[PDB]
C-alpha cells in the first residue's frame, strides 16, 4: 500500500473501508 492515491485526491477520500482495511494489516502493529 502507498500513500500516492491517497494524498492525490484529498483527505475525506482516506476515509474509506479499503483504507480501514489496509491499516490493519499493513500497519497492523503501527
Given at each position: 500500500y502507498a500513500e500516492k492515491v491517497a494524498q492525490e485526491k484529498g483527505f475525506l477520500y482516506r476515509l474509506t473501508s479499503r483504507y480501514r482495511?489496509?491499516?490493519?494489516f499493513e500497519r497492523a502493529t503501527f
Open positions: 482495511h489496509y491499516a490493519a
